[PDB]
Design a protein around this ligand. Structure first.
Ligand code: HEM
Ligand code: HEM
Ligand SMILES: Cc1ccnc(CCCCCO[C@H]2CNC[C@H]2Cc2cc(C)cc(N)n2)c1
Ligand SMILES: Cc1ccnc(CCCCCO[C@H]2CNC[C@H]2Cc2cc(C)cc(N)n2)c1
Ligand SMILES: C[C@H](O)[C@H](O)[C@H]1CNc2nc(N)[nH]c(=O)c2N1
Ligand SMILES: C[C@H](O)[C@H](O)[C@H]1CNc2nc(N)[nH]c(=O)c2N1
Ligand SMILES: [Zn+2]
Lengths: 405, 405
């Protein structure tokens, strides 16, 4: 009736009962599993009222004031506001609780042990792209904290029935340019070709390097996006070198300290926050393995292998595996040297097992997407490989949304 | 778009639609509410007839005689036989076709580019445990072929009306003993503790090494199972050494050549072959990553990292990743030196991508279990990591079944 969940390394079993709290359908059916898909195909008063009620219930329960006078009266306010206006507004503490919960509920995040520690900036009094820019700079400054990174989210004004959304066009707050060449190849980050071209077209003067930090395209409702250059001093970067391989630094590779996602929608109690960028810190495999070694990213494996004089002629010398390990080591080494927060995939997955255990006792379950939780190198060397996981959508939630153009 | 799952490759940017999933007649464990794709384990007159009719239609399509006189005569023959006996029997060529199709349909197999090349040993005349042993030995000789391995399956009599099943008790034809020690530790393969203890219960005199080959426990209908020692000359093994680390040979590690699953049930047109062991050749990660490095298997990572002089006190030295690469390289190198067929995870996943493309054209999709297809080291370094996959159950199929004890 409820899934039995087993860890195959330790032989232990739990039962997920939290999944019964889901009211939002994923992509799978009994005929076929679509759990490996990156995006869903997918991309009213009575229904808003019930999501609103359920969330306010979640909130008064968390502060143990469930059933109290304040609880009853808050349910009255939400109802009164919805019945008259078709929408409502959260109190700041509710917002803070909802933001933490959305992160707690995020199935693709291996960093959730940290979920209770989140600085929430209320930017709902934002009324212009210029104001968005100031809030975003304050966030970057707070979060970066000279390398001692602190989790944060900034929440811009919710979507409203009448008008366009507040949006940040960039997928992250820091992104390196990707310049398409005559010969179809890319200079810089192939993942950002399209945003790079949008920036240029809205007036940005492009450089010509592999690691040019992009400007931000910020959009206030029903207005053209505006371009804002991040002051170079706010964007902490880490030059990559290797503990033992001297030539590695001569690759001139680097990455930014702050992973801040800015294209996801935050849904809390039926309300939708179309711009609500959040940041934590990197797990090294995001940089070392994916951003640098994906064939459709910086694609440096071969280059590194040749520098290592590895036998490139044949897959069976495991040249790819050997080069990837060294690149992941260089990332860890460099971030440690620069005193910038980072976590390796072993430490991260161990803390996630602890999180799974915490959540079992607290909530009777934890929604997790095995394909995203298990790291991109050394999967079975981490405890999460051997752990069964149930994936489902709880609300508050972070969600994908269409690109504004 | 088409009303079938859309399937994307994120490396190449290419898109397909899976129409083959419509042919699924059996539910997996997922629902709209929660994905359970990461679970290792899942869970007749009128029913049999339709399963039979379906398989016969499959057979006649595969030979392009769909709707033909022979086709309608076979259908009639099948229902008459079911009508008077409650069961029916496959023609030889139907068995060969059904076995290949069960392999082709197996979502957890990365080796399926080879599916059309299977030697099908028909053993449906077998009537004793002694004869099972002869068949199995012949299978082992043929499949091993002095290290030039050839895929094969031997099929024993199907399940019958209230009569007992043919079963091989061992989970594989080759398994190393796992001896529980006084201190609670295990000498040998911890995977095989239960089967080892069953062997001793049935009169096997145990050894005391890390790599003692187990005897087979074989069961003819309604008989206690009988014990048979494999003649050592039939069991090809590869001593493990490393191409540059000279001390690696001194570890005395080894693995057997022939991976041969013996506990699975082969289902064809409603008929159930409870003993139908099949074999191919290893992908190297199966030995060097899982069998040697799993914490609950030989668990050699630390020992090898110490020999390599790694810093095992901190996760961030990537000592685990480095040791695993070398163990994997030692597996590849040693199999190559010994002239025993093996495939590395790069070559294997490349060939699985070719298989995906052949099957798109031939059948409009391919059922695939992403968590199983992606190798347990170097995941995103292989092309399959970036390939979305649709998982569903087609028949003919290999299924898990209860242990006979
Ligand atoms: C505290 C440090 C954190 C670490 C080490 C971490 C770790 C990770 C990793 C490795 C991923 C997968 C990224 C990828 O493969 O591209 C991820 C995804 C994600 N994380 Fe975290 N996380 C952290 C904090 C946060 C915070 C503060 C939030 C929100 C408040 C968050 C919410 C999410 C969401 C929604 C995803 C999925 C992103 C997507 O689908 O594009 N995480 N996390
Ligand atoms: C030809 C060489 C082959 C290679 C390299 C290969 C590769 C593999 C690998 C790596 C696995 C996963 C094993 C694990 O993680 O423990 C697997 C599973 C599987 N393969 Fe193959 N395969 C081959 C041939 C075959 C053959 C001949 C058959 C049957 C006719 C077969 C059917 C299966 C099935 C049913 C599974 C799932 C086993 C289970 O769930 O226990 N494969 N294959
Ligand atoms: C807070 C935090 C901590 C550690 N890392 C990060 C960065 C996460 C980057 C996730 C980017 O995901 C992109 C690129 N690869 C899969 C794809 C999934 C996706 C698709 C869409 C439409 C939006 C989105 N945010 N994510 C953020
Ligand atoms: C033909 C071939 C080619 C390459 N490799 C192989 C070996 C496959 C061995 C798979 C063993 O599976 C076991 C051990 N790990 C997960 C678990 C799944 C499982 C469970 C059960 C009850 C039966 C079974 N056959 N498989 C076979
Ligand atoms: C197709 C497949 O689902 C896709 O490659 C996923 C696999 N697992 C992942 N896991 C994480 N953390 N991030 C990713 O981008 C991906 N990509
Ligand atoms: C819990 C998880 O499903 C389990 O550890 C799976 C993951 N992927 C796998 N993939 C393969 N090929 N073989 C396995 O045994 C497993 N184990
Ligand atoms: Zn699923």
């Amino acid at each position: 009736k409820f899934p039995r969940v087993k860890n195959w390394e330790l032989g232990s079993i739990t039962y997920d009962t939290l999944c019964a709290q889901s009211q939002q359908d994923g992509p799978c059916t009994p005929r076929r599993c679509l759990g490996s898909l990156v995006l869903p195909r997918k991309l009213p008063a009575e229904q808003l009222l019930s999501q609103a009620r359920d969330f306010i219930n979640q909130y008064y329960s968390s502060i143990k004031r469930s059933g109290s006078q304040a609880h009853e009266e808050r349910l009255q306010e939400v109802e009164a506001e919805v019945a008259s206006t078709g929408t409502y507004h959260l109190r700041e503490s509710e917002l803070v609780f909802g933001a933490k919960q959305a992160w707690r509920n995020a199935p693709r995040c291996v960093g959730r042990i940290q979920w209770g520690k989140l600085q929430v900036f209320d930017a709902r009094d934002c009324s212009s792209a210029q104001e968005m820019f100031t809030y975003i700079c304050n966030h970057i400054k707070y979060a970066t904290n000279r390398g001692n990174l602190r989790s944060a989210i900034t929440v811009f004004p919710q979507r409203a029935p009448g008008r366009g959304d507040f949006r940040i066009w960039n997928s992250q707050l820091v992104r390196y340019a990707g310049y398409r060449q005559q010969d179809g190849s890319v200079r810089g980050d192939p993942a950002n070709v399209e945003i790079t071209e949008l920036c240029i077209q809205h007036g940005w003067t492009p450089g010509n390097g592999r690691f040019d930090v992009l400007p931000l395209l910020l959009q206030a409702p029903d207005e053209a996006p505006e371009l804002f250059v991040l002051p170079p001093e706010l964007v902490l970067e880490v030059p990559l070198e290797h503990p033992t391989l001297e030539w590695f630094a001569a690759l001139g590779l680097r990455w930014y300290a702050l992973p801040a996602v800015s294209n996801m929608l935050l849904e809390i109690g039926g309300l939708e926050f179309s711009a609500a960028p959040f940041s934590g810190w990197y797990m090294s495999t995001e940089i070392g393995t994916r951003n640098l070694c994906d064939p459709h990213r910086y694609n440096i494996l071969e280059d590194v292998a040749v520098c290592m004089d590895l036998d490139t002629r044949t897959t069976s010398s495991l040249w790819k595996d050997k080069a990837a390990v060294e690149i992941n080591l260089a990332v860890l080494h460099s971030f440690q040297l620069a005193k910038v927060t980072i976590v390796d995939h072993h430490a991260a997955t161990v803390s996630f097992m602890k999180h799974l255990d915490n959540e079992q006792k607290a909530r009777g379950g934890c929604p997790a997407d095995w394909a995203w939780i298990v790291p991109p190198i050394s999967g079975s060397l981490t405890p999460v490989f051997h752990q069964e996981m149930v994936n489902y959508i709880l609300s508050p939630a972070f969600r994908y949304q269409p690109d504004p153009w």
